Amino acid sequence: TTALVCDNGSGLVKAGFAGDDAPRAVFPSIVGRPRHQGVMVGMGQKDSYVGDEAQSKRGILTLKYPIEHGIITNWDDMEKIWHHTFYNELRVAPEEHPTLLTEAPLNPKANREKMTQIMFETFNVPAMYVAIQAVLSLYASGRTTGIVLDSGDGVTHNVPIYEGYALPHAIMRLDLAGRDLTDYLMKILTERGYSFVTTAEREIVRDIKEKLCYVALDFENEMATAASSSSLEKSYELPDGQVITIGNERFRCPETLFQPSFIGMESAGIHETTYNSIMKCDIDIRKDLYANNVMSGGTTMYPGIADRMQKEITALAPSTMKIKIIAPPERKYSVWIGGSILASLSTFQQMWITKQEYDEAGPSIVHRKCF
Amino acid sequence: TTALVCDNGSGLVKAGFAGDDAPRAVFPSIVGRPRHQGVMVGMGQKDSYVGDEAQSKRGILTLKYPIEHGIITNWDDMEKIWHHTFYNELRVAPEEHPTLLTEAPLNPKANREKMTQIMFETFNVPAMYVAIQAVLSLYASGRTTGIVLDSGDGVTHNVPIYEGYALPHAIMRLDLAGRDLTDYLMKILTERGYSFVTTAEREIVRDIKEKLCYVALDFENEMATAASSSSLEKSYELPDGQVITIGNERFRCPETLFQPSFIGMESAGIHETTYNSIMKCDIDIRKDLYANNVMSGGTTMYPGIADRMQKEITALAPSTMKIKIIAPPERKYSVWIGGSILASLSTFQQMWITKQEYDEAGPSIVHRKCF
Amino acid sequence: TTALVCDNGSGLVKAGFAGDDAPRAVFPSIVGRPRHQGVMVGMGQKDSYVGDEAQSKRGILTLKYPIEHGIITNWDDMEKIWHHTFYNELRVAPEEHPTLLTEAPLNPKANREKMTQIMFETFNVPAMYVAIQAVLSLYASGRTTGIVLDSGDGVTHNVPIYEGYALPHAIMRLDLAGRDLTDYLMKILTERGYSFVTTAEREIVRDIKEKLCYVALDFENEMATAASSSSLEKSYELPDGQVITIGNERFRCPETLFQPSFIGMESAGIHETTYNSIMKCDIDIRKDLYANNVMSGGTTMYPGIADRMQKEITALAPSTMKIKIIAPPERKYSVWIGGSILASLSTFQQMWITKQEYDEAGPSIVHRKCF
Amino acid sequence: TTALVCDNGSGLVKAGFAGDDAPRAVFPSIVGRPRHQGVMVGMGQKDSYVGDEAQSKRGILTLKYPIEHGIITNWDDMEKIWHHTFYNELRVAPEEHPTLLTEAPLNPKANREKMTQIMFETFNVPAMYVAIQAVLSLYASGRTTGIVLDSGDGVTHNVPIYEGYALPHAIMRLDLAGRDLTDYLMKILTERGYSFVTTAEREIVRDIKEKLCYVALDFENEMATAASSSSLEKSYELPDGQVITIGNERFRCPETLFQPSFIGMESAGIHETTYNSIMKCDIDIRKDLYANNVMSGGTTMYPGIADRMQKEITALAPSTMKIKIIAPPERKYSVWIGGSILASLSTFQQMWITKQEYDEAGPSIVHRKCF
Amino acid sequence: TTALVCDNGSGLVKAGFAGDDAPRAVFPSIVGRPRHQGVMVGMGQKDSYVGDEAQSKRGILTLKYPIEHGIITNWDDMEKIWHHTFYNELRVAPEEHPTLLTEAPLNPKANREKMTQIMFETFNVPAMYVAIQAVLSLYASGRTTGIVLDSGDGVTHNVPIYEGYALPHAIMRLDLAGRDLTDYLMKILTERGYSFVTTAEREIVRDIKEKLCYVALDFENEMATAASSSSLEKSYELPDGQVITIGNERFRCPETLFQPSFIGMESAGIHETTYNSIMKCDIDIRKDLYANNVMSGGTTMYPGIADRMQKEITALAPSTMKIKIIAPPERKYSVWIGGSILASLSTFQQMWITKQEYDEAGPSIVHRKCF
Ligand SMILES: Nc1ncnc2c1ncn2[C@@H]1O[C@H](COP(=O)(O)OP(=O)(O)O)[C@@H](O)[C@H]1O
Ligand SMILES: Nc1ncnc2c1ncn2[C@@H]1O[C@H](COP(=O)(O)OP(=O)(O)O)[C@@H](O)[C@H]1O
Ligand SMILES: Nc1ncnc2c1ncn2[C@@H]1O[C@H](COP(=O)(O)OP(=O)(O)O)[C@@H](O)[C@H]1O
Ligand SMILES: Nc1ncnc2c1ncn2[C@@H]1O[C@H](COP(=O)(O)OP(=O)(O)O)[C@@H](O)[C@H]1O
Ligand SMILES: Nc1ncnc2c1ncn2[C@@H]1O[C@H](COP(=O)(O)OP(=O)(O)O)[C@@H](O)[C@H]1O
Ligand SMILES: [Mg+2]
Ligand SMILES: [Mg+2]
Ligand SMILES: [Mg+2]
Ligand SMILES: [Mg+2]
Ligand SMILES: [Mg+2]
Structure with a gap:
């Protein structure tokens, strides 16, 4: 069974x-659906490719997300x-x-x-x-109490759990995620001079993001550093041999999670929404929640994002609040x-x-x- | 049936x-049509000869291409x-x-x-x-993906196919072919001092071209070589016994495919048009197209043309693009x-x-x- | 000053x-650069012609766009x-x-x-x-609010402005423009049987497009109409006297703006990109944007394009959205x-x-x- | 009928x-017309004799050619x-x-x-x-292709025929023939010391020519041979018993066909005119014409003339041109x-x-x- | 200097x-070289006469063209x-x-x-x-643009020039010229019954041609006119007093330029080769070339040849092409x-x-x- x-x-x-x-x-x-006209007989084709099929035919099919x-x-x-x-x-x-x-x-x-x-x-x-995704994240961590900051491709959501139960009124779902980061990156790649415009390229850029992007600990000074240094310039060989090189964009992209206004988003930064969710919880438990900031979802796989997150939350929180973030290998x-x-x-x-x-x-x- | x-x-x-x-x-x-006056009775003649009939009467009939x-x-x-x-x-x-x-x-x-x-x-x-000629060329090769550079007597065309389908917008038909090569050769034979002017001679010259012409790998230096060497001078016995000898013209003729301006042609060289067609294709597939440069048509039967083609494309393409040309025996x-x-x-x-x-x-x- | x-x-x-x-x-x-060999002394020539100089020597010079x-x-x-x-x-x-x-x-x-x-x-x-082109377009119109659909020779871009400011994240630049329309037209002129292939001809065809092409209001039925009527067949006297006559191609060309796939373009139709840009804007202002669809750029000079645009947008939008397009004389x-x-x-x-x-x-x- | x-x-x-x-x-x-006064009554005469009548009265009548x-x-x-x-x-x-x-x-x-x-x-x-004489000559030979070198008493003409048709522009008529050979012979007989001066004698000399003259294969050395040998001296019994003996003149006479300048003739030698006619023909057929050099007319009845002709043409032509002369018995x-x-x-x-x-x-x- | x-x-x-x-x-x-034997001592002779020397001794010397x-x-x-x-x-x-x-x-x-x-x-x-002859012709005309139809004794060639430069690929050299016209005339003079056969006579006939020949505007009807009229019969007093009279031959001779097949020539008529050269030129300039058809060379000195040329070209060209021929006095x-x-x-x-x-x-x- x-x-x-x-x-x-x-x-x-x-x-x-x-x-x-x-x-x-x-x-x-x-799901990929033939972007072009069907010349050639006995092509072995079908009007639907999925998963790795769509990937293999990434630039032939119109790629859609269901x-x-x-x-x-x-x-x-x-x-x-x-x-x-x-x-x-x-x-x-x-x-x-x-x-x-x-x-x-x-x-x-x-x-x-x-x-x-x-x-x-x-x-x-x-x-x-x-089942609710956040809840399952704690099951993986083996915790009965904590804040679950679950941020993936789809959406980002923050759930507060405390010896089970979960507090509905403090659950916040934020429409900001991996796909938005990807799109934003493409926009700033244009600024640099790399016209990425296709969905095939959205997918390629997704990889680029995954390979090079990282989270600044001090965005302002790291930006200033980038403005006077080639040390952050990293090269990436596109499928057709076109090597491209990316600078400050490499961290400007993930920075948008902390400053959503960069993509025209009304809401507060990811760390602020975390904080606010905790503020909606009773002061009897807030301390424990601060000590169990469980991070998960693919968008938390950026270098230094946990460190940045800690820094940010620490600033928002009062002294004595031992901000403890939980973000193990394979949290993805x-x-x-x-x-x-x-x-x-x-x-x-x-x-x-x-x-x-x-x-x-x-x-x-x-x-x-x-x- | x-x-x-x-x-x-x-x-x-x-x-x-x-x-x-x-x-x-x-x-x-x-189709050959009696260039001269009909004296002699019971000649067994008809006012139309075709194929090998026209060939046998090549210098008697006005030869036309339909x-x-x-x-x-x-x-x-x-x-x-x-x-x-x-x-x-x-x-x-x-x-x-x-x-x-x-x-x-x-x-x-x-x-x-x-x-x-x-x-x-x-x-x-x-x-x-x-059916489209290019498509059939791949059927012969047994490929579902590749670039078809089909260049014969009539015209030259470049088609991009990728697991069937074919990409219309990247198909380019170039009005430069075997007949133009032939005519150009006659013009430079005049420079040497062999007044080939007739259609019968166009046909004779076609054979001459087929027998002697070849593609330079380094046109400039091979030209320079010819300028100081008789090693490339080859003799050809014309129908009436007039042996002629041809030098640098022997590769200057096919060179025009790579430098069309030689015949007053506006467009880019054959390898550049190949490259450009590939550029019109999505970067997701460009690499595979580079690895399947199928050449066909009678004008690809020149010695070293594939080698030259590879060299040229390799220069145009970026590193890692393993330019692989496909040009088997009988590709004609x-x-x-x-x-x-x-x-x-x-x-x-x-x-x-x-x-x-x-x-x-x-x-x-x-x-x-x-x- | x-x-x-x-x-x-x-x-x-x-x-x-x-x-x-x-x-x-x-x-x-x-910029025009001598396509041919310099015989004749004291020609009064220079190796660069611009603007109307290049036009006068259109078929002598290699014409390039910087x-x-x-x-x-x-x-x-x-x-x-x-x-x-x-x-x-x-x-x-x-x-x-x-x-x-x-x-x-x-x-x-x-x-x-x-x-x-x-x-x-x-x-x-x-x-x-x-300054941004779109913004200036509104200055000409005297508006502080509206959608600017600016589509010229170079590119097409859609900007949303609302009492100034402009909303970055909803700005979309589409790589589809007058030059693509021109090239497409040449391709379908070949279908008819008019081998336009040269840059001189690209320029000639540009005029042809400007003189005859128009936007269908119901492409499908107008296509069907063309299939059974000579009323749309219009003649054009080429420079050398070669009068040509153009049928359905006359509107099939500009139609590609609404169905980009015709030239192998991935993206949605021009009206859909307009709509989508508006969708990226807050619902508090969408209505006003719908009432101020400012069109500009040379590619909006087609007969009935505004009417077609209205029809299309109206279909995409919900009832009560009084789609008002602004497209005055000299908007070019x-x-x-x-x-x-x-x-x-x-x-x-x-x-x-x-x-x-x-x-x-x-x-x-x-x-x-x-x- | x-x-x-x-x-x-x-x-x-x-x-x-x-x-x-x-x-x-x-x-x-x-036609013979009474050279002398009519004494004797009932002579059975008429003021016109033709053919063999004129021959029987050869030295009585003034002989004229119509x-x-x-x-x-x-x-x-x-x-x-x-x-x-x-x-x-x-x-x-x-x-x-x-x-x-x-x-x-x-x-x-x-x-x-x-x-x-x-x-x-x-x-x-x-x-x-x-009908054209040359054409009929090929009908006799049963050929549809060849060069007709027709040289008789009247004139010499060279026609090129190729599967019928005939090529007008390469037809050459040469005003050099049997009558000129005859007259020349008389002139050189005077050198020897045989005053042949009359028309009756022109006719007698015609026979002499027919009986003794032959074509040298190497005129120069055969002339030299004659200069030191009596072996070529041949005797001929004239009607009145006057036996005459002829030496080098015996081949010097027919030699004039190959070196027309001997009689003050501007044009090239007979073999050269043959060659030239062939040169006026397309190289597609020249080879076949070389292989079908049909000779006819009474002046080709000289011993060794075909051999000499071959030698001469062979020298003029290029290697591989298998000069084949056709000159059967009764070609006259x-x-x-x-x-x-x-x-x-x-x-x-x-x-x-x-x-x-x-x-x-x-x-x-x-x-x-x-x- | x-x-x-x-x-x-x-x-x-x-x-x-x-x-x-x-x-x-x-x-x-x-160059004239003594056709005959040197009797007479102290003749003041030399074995080479040139120009007018050769002319004075035209029938004594063998006349050759270098x-x-x-x-x-x-x-x-x-x-x-x-x-x-x-x-x-x-x-x-x-x-x-x-x-x-x-x-x-x-x-x-x-x-x-x-x-x-x-x-x-x-x-x-x-x-x-x-320098190229055609180019110099335009210098004389003071033009920077035009078609040069240069047709003299030697050869005929057609060059297209446009604000200098010249377009190589459209340059055509035709092996049909004054000498061919002369020879053809002799051939048809034989038809009439005037055995012109010598080089001295070729030269005499050259004058005859120059004095009497003219270009028909409607060859067919003018031929028909000649067939029923003595008005075209013109007399010419040969050096020795032999007056000859020439009829239809007078324009049949120059007609061969328009119908080359008359002398067995493969190629198209002179006006057709002009047209074709223009067809090889870009349509951007064809119109100007049509308006500048510069004619030169001695063979354009025939009465009505320009008018005939215009008629012919006009028929070949499309409406609106204002065929303008330039053929001034002394263009020879x-x-x-x-x-x-x-x-x-x-x-x-x-x-x-x-x-x-x-x-x-x-x-x-x-x-x-x-x-
Ligand atoms: N190693 C990584 N580095 C950076 N970003 C990543 C990494 N892995 C995944 N992502 C991003 O996270 C998203 C996928 O994570 P996932 O949690 O599986 O999303 P979902 O839960 O919606 O499936 C994608 O947008 C992806 O680009
Ligand atoms: N062996 C050869 N070497 C060089 N050129 C050739 C050879 N065979 C054919 N060609 C040229 O290619 C042309 C014929 O090729 P083909 O592909 O049959 O033309 P098409 O496809 O238009 O029939 C002719 O112009 C011919 O001269
Ligand atoms: N009257 C017209 N009708 C149709 N198309 C036009 C017209 N005028 C210009 N165009 C097209 O629009 C383009 C020029 O417009 P313009 O806005 O000046 O372009 P750009 O802004 O890039 O300069 C050209 O591609 C041209 O063919
Ligand atoms: N057996 C022969 N040997 C040499 N010469 C001959 C012979 N028979 C004829 N001839 C010459 O050829 C001419 C006759 O040949 P023929 O072809 O009948 O002339 P035509 O065609 O003009 O009648 C005469 O000049 C004659 O002397
Ligand atoms: N006035 C004329 N009328 C007719 N034909 C002429 C005249 N003058 C010259 N020709 C012909 O043109 C040729 C000479 O012209 P020219 O242009 O000097 O030749 P080339 O350029 O080869 O020297 C000769 O064949 C001559 O017969
Ligand atoms: Mg998830
Ligand atoms: Mg083919
Ligand atoms: Mg603009
Ligand atoms: Mg005869
Ligand atoms: Mg000249």
């Missing part, structure tokens, strides 16, 4: 089974990704065991409801449960890892929503009871 | 059937060539099976349309399909060969345009649907 | 002075154009007064920086200021006109970058402070 | 019918010869069947025109056709023989010019249409 | 000095002509000043090279320059005149090839640098 864990995030989908130590199936949430802002849009294509996932990446038929899904808290309930329908109609799984996958744990974690058997219950009450009961 | 493949190029027409390994009928696209610049002009004479082809070279009546025709992409649609009419009215073939006929394949290639049965469909919709539907 | 306004766009350079009502110097951004994609490439030749401009078209020496330059937002900063150097070293102007020059205004507009004296400041801080300060 | 063939050459007239293998009527083109240089002069006497021919030699009245006449190409059209009148007014033949009559063939040759019925057509259009139409 | 201009054309050599308004030395390019087809053959005799020219016609020793030579473009470079040697070794001139000498100008034309001093440079680099540098 066992169970299947599916970290259906944007950008990357991470799948593996209960009790596994690593999301064996890591591939991109991309979801955006943590919201599922192209339901058909999303479904197709799951189909591929289960049958080609995992190679297991739904009915063999229940599936653990996940979502970022505070998102249009239609997502949860429609996924439920799909799971119990397209796939017809034994049972299903959708902590949500999926937590899922592996929770799914295998005995007691959880009573939480699964059975197909029977779906057939009885329907979608809405999941909306009501599953968290 | 089977099917007939007809490589209706300029200069040479290559015909044979589906599944054949060699265009059994190779003969020139020439097509030029890949465009069909003298429709009547072109038709006559096809008539001869089918009935004397192939010795098969149209209705026995469908015919695969071919054309260079980006040419006045009237060609396609009027050929269609002829095929289904003069010949009344079962079904017909006109790769288009016809590809036709043999495609015609026999099962699936292609669904592409044939039937006479019924012609009768229903007419010419324009072929223009619209057949590629 | 006064001041000089220089609309240094691609294709056409428009110059005149502050307070003028018409760019007295309108001439093409072309800039492309809004980016300055051949700095030397660009400089030469400015030299000619100031001394022969305007007949005024730099030091007499400051010069207002202009650029399309979001372009490799090296342009701005190097122009700055030239202005204060080759010309040594009193003071200089580079609105940028230069705006420059005339702004330069004369008192307050602007505090914005000029003085040569002193250049000498003090250098290029980079202009990059930093001038917009 | 059948038809009559009349080889109206100078010197000898050869007549016979279509399909005959030998010109049954061979007699000289001479034509000279291939041109008809004494029309009356020429007519009289034809009268005699038809009625005494052939013994057939004109109206019984059509008559094939012949002429050397490139001669004053008045000949053709006036003969036409005579044929359809004096004789009133059913139909008539005048090849023109008449060809006539016999052509006249009997079915198809030729469509070429005959009918008396009706003569009566309709008149002389000029023959000039225009008959060749 | 000054300079000497030598129009070394075939047929006539025209010499005079820089700045002169008329080639003071006009005499024929003929050059043919614009190619120098008998170098020795050509040299002798120049010797005579300089010392007897001009009466000036080489070293006094530089000499301007001329040639028709597109001729065996050996001519240029060997002349160079002679000029700087036989004559040892200060400096020398060989325009090349020499142009030479007079260019040689005196200041700047040209920098073009002269000095004897020093010859001694330094040798012949080949002239081939390379002088045009």
